[PDB]
Amino acid sequence: PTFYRQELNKTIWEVPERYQNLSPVGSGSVCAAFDTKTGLRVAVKKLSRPFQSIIHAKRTYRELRLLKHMKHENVIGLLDVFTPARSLEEFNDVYLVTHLMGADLNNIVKCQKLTDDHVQFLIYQILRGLKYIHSADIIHRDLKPSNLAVNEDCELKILDFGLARHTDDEMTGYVATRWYRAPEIMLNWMHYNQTVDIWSVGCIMAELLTGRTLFPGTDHIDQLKLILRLVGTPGAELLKKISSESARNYIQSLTQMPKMNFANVFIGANPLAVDLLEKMLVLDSDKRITAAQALAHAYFAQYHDPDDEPVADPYDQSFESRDLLIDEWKSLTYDEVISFVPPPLD
Amino acid sequence: GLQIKKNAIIDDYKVTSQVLGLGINGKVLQIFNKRTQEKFALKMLQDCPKARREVELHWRASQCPHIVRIVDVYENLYAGRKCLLIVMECLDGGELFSRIQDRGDQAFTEREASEIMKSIGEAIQYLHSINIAHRDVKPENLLYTSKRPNAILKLTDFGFAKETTSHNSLTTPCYTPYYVAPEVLGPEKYDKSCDMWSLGVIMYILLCGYPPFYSNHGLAIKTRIRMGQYEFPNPEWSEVSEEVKMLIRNLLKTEPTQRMTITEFMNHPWIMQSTKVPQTPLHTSRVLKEDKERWEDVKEEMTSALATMRVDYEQIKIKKIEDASNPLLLKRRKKARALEAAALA
Numbered sequence: 001p002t003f004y005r006q007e008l009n010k011t012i013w014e015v016p017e018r019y020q021n022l023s024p025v026g027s028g029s030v031c032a033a034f035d036t037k038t039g040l041r042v043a044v045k046k047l048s049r050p051f052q053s054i055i056h057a058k059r060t061y062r063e064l065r066l067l068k069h070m071k072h073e074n075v076i077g078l079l080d081v082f083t084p085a086r087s088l089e090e091f092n093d094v095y096l097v098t099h100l101m102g103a104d105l106n107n108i109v110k111c112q113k114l115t116d117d118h119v120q121f122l123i124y125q126i127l128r129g130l131k132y133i134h135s136a137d138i139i140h141r142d143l144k145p146s147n148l149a150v151n152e153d154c155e156l157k158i159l160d161f162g163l164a165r166h167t168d169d170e171m172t173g174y175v176a177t178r179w180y181r182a183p184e185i186m187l188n189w190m191h192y193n194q195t196v197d198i199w200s201v202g203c204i205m206a207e208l209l210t211g212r213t214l215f216p217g218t219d220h221i222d223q224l225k226l227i228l229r230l231v232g233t234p235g236a237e238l239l240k241k242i243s244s245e246s247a248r249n250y251i252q253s254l255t256q257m258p259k260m261n262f263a264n265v266f267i268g269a270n271p272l273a274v275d276l277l278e279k280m281l282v283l284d285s286d287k288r289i290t291a292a293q294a295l296a297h298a299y300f301a302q303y304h305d306p307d308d309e310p311v312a313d314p315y316d317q318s319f320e321s322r323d324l325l326i327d328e329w330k331s332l333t334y335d336e337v338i339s340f341v342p343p344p345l346d
Numbered sequence: 347g348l349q350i351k352k353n354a355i356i357d358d359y360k361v362t363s364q365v366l367g368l369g370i371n372g373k374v375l376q377i378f379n380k381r382t383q384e385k386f387a388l389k390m391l392q393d394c395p396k397a398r399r400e401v402e403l404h405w406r407a408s409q410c411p412h413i414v415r416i417v418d419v420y421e422n423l424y425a426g427r428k429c430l431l432i433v434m435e436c437l438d439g440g441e442l443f444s445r446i447q448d449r450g451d452q453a454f455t456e457r458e459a460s461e462i463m464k465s466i467g468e469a470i471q472y473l474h475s476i477n478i479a480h481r482d483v484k485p486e487n488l489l490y491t492s493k494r495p496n497a498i499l500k501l502t503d504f505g506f507a508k509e510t511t512s513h514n515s516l517t518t519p520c521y522t523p524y525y526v527a528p529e530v531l532g533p534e535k536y537d538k539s540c541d542m543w544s545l546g547v548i549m550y551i552l553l554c555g556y557p558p559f560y561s562n563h564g565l566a567i568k569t570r571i572r573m574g575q576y577e578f579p580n581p582e583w584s585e586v587s588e589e590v591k592m593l594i595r596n597l598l599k600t601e602p603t604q605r606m607t608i609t610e611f612m613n614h615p616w617i618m619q620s621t622k623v624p625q626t627p628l629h630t631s632r633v634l635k636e637d638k639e640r641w642e643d644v645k646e647e648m649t650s651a652l653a654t655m656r657v658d659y660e661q662i663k664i665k666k667i668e669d670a671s672n673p674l675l676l677k678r679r680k681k682a683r684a685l686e687a688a689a690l691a
């Protein structure tokens with residue numbers, strides 16, 4: 001392999017000459033390019049400062065190992081990873097290549113009036129993508145309209161695997177973005193057993209159907225007010241499942257309200273779309289619908305095919321919970337860069 | 347009314363190989379004008395429909411001391427590329443918070459943060475008066491002219507600049523129905539409102555030395571379950587004025603329309619009569635000094651969160667479902683034909 005130097009995004013880029021016409025994108029260090037060996041138009045991402053702190057060096061090895069295992073048509077899929085360094089001694093930079101997309105939902109919502117048929121196919125592939133990512137034990141934890149890229153025609157891919165891990169009983173609290181986070185996170189500390197993203201799509205599904213935000217919580221506390229306004233205050237049967245005492249006293253301080261029929265708030269929406277939203281926005285986490293069950297909903301009778309909704313091979317942890325030196329994560333990241341086998345474009 | 351000179355740059359200027367930092371789309375070079383011996387900088391800015399509308403706006407904002415002065419723009423060819431050679435005033439003072447980073451003994455006062463914000467406000471007030479909505483106002487785009495204390499803070503990085511419509515929003519009423527009405531698309535409402543959003547963040551950064559958002563979040567003004575007093579934590583926000591602590595609430599309002607405008611921000615007492623501002627000491631100089639490595643991440647998350655406050659007009663429109671095609675679309679539609687032929691026999 002041979003590289004060529006180029007100054008882009010306030011840094012110097014030396015990528016293989018199989019990627020030509022490197023052009024910046026904006027805020028996003030990513031560059032739009034053309035791949036000669038595949039004939040496709042791809043995007044190349046430059047990890048700015050990948051190894052500066054123990055958290056950064058550990059997160060890079062954790063992140064890179066995830067993109068390796070992702071093999072869907074609705075999830076982001078690593079086409080090529082490389083580094084200009086020939087040996088480990090000169091290894092201080094890394095790059096990532098993936099399909100170029102064109103847009104993201106967040107900018108689409110603020111720009112386009114989406115139709116009911118749009119929501120059917122857009123949410124379908126999310127749930128179809130949700131089935132894959134959840135097949136291997138993992139939580140996306142950052143599902144939001146700015147993390148779902150959308151192409152010119154209709155294809156979309158899930159993005160931003162920065163905060164995702166194999167499901168465990170106890171794990172880092174206060175994780176998801178609030179407007180698209182579940183009420184379990186602040187109510188119960190080591191909760192959120194693979195249901196926030198399902199709850200997040202419910203928030204996302206109402207974004208496309210409306211154009212505004214379901215729960216635009218100003219502060220952390222205002223989130224609990226706007227959520228419980230729609231889903232109703234939890235009953236004493238569920239109020240015992242709450243972990244914190246200071247939290248339980250807060251819920252008991254609001255005016256008690258029940259669930260309102262979601263068909264009364266979403267005017268003009270599809271009754272099946274409202275019926276799915278009622279299943280994706282249930283306070284009881286154990287009773288909320290799963291992604292595998294969400295595909296069988298009648299809202300996707302136009303696109304549901306039970307033979308083309310594949311699952312994953314389980315991804316084991318194997319080093320993700322260890323604590324090592326900066327150089328160890330840099331070498332463990334190196335071992336996974338050379339071990340990458342690109343897939344053939346059948 | 348700017349006229350792009352079409353003649354080669356080497357006829358009037360002397361280009362050197364000395365690099366003045368790396369830009370986003372190329373290299374910044376040192377450049378002198380022989381007729382004046384005036385040192386400048388050079389921007390590549392490859393020619394395109396985007397480049398000519400930006401320079402048209404950065405030209406208009408040049409007659410504002412708190413905005414870097416464009417001196418002239420050429421249209422020549424470099425490395426076989428149709429380029430728009432841009433010459434600018436050389437800014438040597440460095441980043442705004444790098445000047446506050448290295449502070450010997452004099453503590454940062456709230457008054458010093460007032461004329462700094464009044465300076466940035468005069469730039470945004472000029473831009474909004476002529477309807478150019480800059481939407482990348484962040485620390486790395488606020489450079490001083492020189493290391494000398496007599497420097498003048500200037501605004502740069504017009505890459506996301508946009509001319510907008512001067513249409514004041516009609517301010518949604520307090521009485522709303524239970525149901526959520528279908529939204530009417532008004533994407534231009536994120537143009538000016540995004541500017542003031544940066545004003546509150548910069549103002550927040552200055553007073554405490556760190557940004558509102560803890561991590562993978564935004565504009566929320568916490569590694570434990572905090573129930574209150576998370577807005578301005580007391581360890582460094584104790585001696586801050588209440589009028590100032592609530593101005594940031596108006597600028598960092600989650601709603602674009604209800605957010606404070608630039609005419610109101612420049613007319614606020616803490617900005618208008620900046621001379622009679624309390625002289626309370628701050629902790630910026632020490633908070634920034636506590637971690638230089640975390641400060642770079644501060645620049646990263648602010649840039650990512652800035653994309654949510656702005657609209658990327660250079661993105662595609664999703665076609666109507668019947669007009670689009672993709673591998674997954676035809677995988678389902680061709681399967682639909684299989685049932686038809688299968689039903690025949």
Ligand SMILES: CCCc1c(C(=O)Nc2cc(S(=O)(=O)N(C)C)ccc2C)cnn1-c1ccccc1
Pocket residue numbers: 025028030043044045067076096097098099100101102103104149158159160161162661
């Ligand atoms: C930040 C989105 C950039 C963007 C992408 C992208 O970011 N691709 C991408 C993701 C990861 S990631 O999921 O692992 N992550 C974010 C860390 C790693 C590597 C690439 C190469 C695709 N289209 N646009 C895009 C968006 C709008 C218009 C045109 C293009």
